[PDB]
Amino acid sequence: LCSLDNGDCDQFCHEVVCSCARGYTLAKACIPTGPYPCGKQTLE
């Protein structure tokens, strides 16, 4: 169930089937595809 540890998903969870925001690919975990993926603070 997504109700326990978010189904182990790094981002989205539905019924387990994980999802990621646009700009990420499913590795559970979600992997950024660029230097400025959504929702990430930026470093110099």
């Binding site: 978010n6 969870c13 999802s19 929702g39 990430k40």
Partner: protein, 234 residues
């Protein structure tokens, strides 16, 4: 933002600022993608003509990474009215695309059902903007952020002079002197989940700022995820 702290470099990169013909900021926004900014519908009434500045952390110094964008299309929720402040949401399509960089990057849009069960149930979110730093004072020349706890809808209703709708939620503090304020409207309320920030709210309204027994009221973005998606494809 009353209380809180200044945003450090790269800390609040999805912040946008709406600027009027005087080149002064009057409302915030949230960067959604290269072409789209999320803001409050009520902001559109404040200036006939406005532009969007991204990358700014200090409105008194021109610094590396600031850029100005013209708005091509304004998409204002058809049900918004000043009578109720309900449906307080608009999307702006820019004329030219934003280049993401230090201090300029989008917040993530969540999936609706997941956001309702997983984000709206977190303890706190983060609000940011260049608004007043005291209810009676002047707008901040520095970008500020503030962690605000989600507030129980029924406590909020009891505290409020005005109707709280299902398209709103409440956040902030009963008596602690920290809150969003005039000028912060339209800006981001984001919620972290496992190292990623998702946009959960739009700064909407409050009875003053940081008043004892009052909270901040935010547009509930989950209620509009489908409306936003449709708007960004229009």
């Amino acid at each position: 933002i009353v209380g809180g702290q200044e945003c450090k470099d790269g800390e609040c990169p999805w912040q946008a600022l709406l600027i009027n013909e005087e080149n002064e900021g009057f409302c915030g926004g949230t960067i959604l993608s290269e072409f789209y900014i999320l803001t409050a519908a009520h902001c559109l009434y404040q200036a006939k003509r406005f532009k969007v500045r991204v990358g700014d952390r200090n409105t008194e110094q021109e610094e590396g990474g600031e850029a100005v964008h013209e708005v091509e299309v304004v998409i204002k929720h058809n049900r918004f009215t000043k009578e109720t402040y309900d449906f307080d949401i608009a999307v702006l399509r820019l004329k030219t695309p934003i280049t993401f960089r230090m201090n300029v990057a989008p917040a993530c849009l969540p999936e609706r059902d997941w956001a309702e069960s997983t984000l709206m149930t977190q303890k706190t979110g983060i609000v940011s903007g260049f608004g007043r730093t005291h209810e009676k004072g002047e707008q901040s020349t520095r970008l500020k952020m503030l962690e605000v706890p989600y507030v129980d809808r029924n406590s909020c209703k009891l505290s409020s002079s005005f109707i709280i709708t299902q398209n709103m939620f409440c956040a902030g503090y009963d008596t602690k002197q920290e809150d969003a304020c005039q000028g912060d409207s339209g800006g981001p309320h984001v919620t972290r989940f496992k190292d990623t920030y998702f946009v959960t709210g739009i700064v909407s309204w409050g009875e003053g700022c940081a008043r004892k027994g009052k909270y901040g009221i935010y547009t509930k973005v989950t209620a509009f995820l489908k409306w936003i998606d449709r708007s960004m494809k229009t």
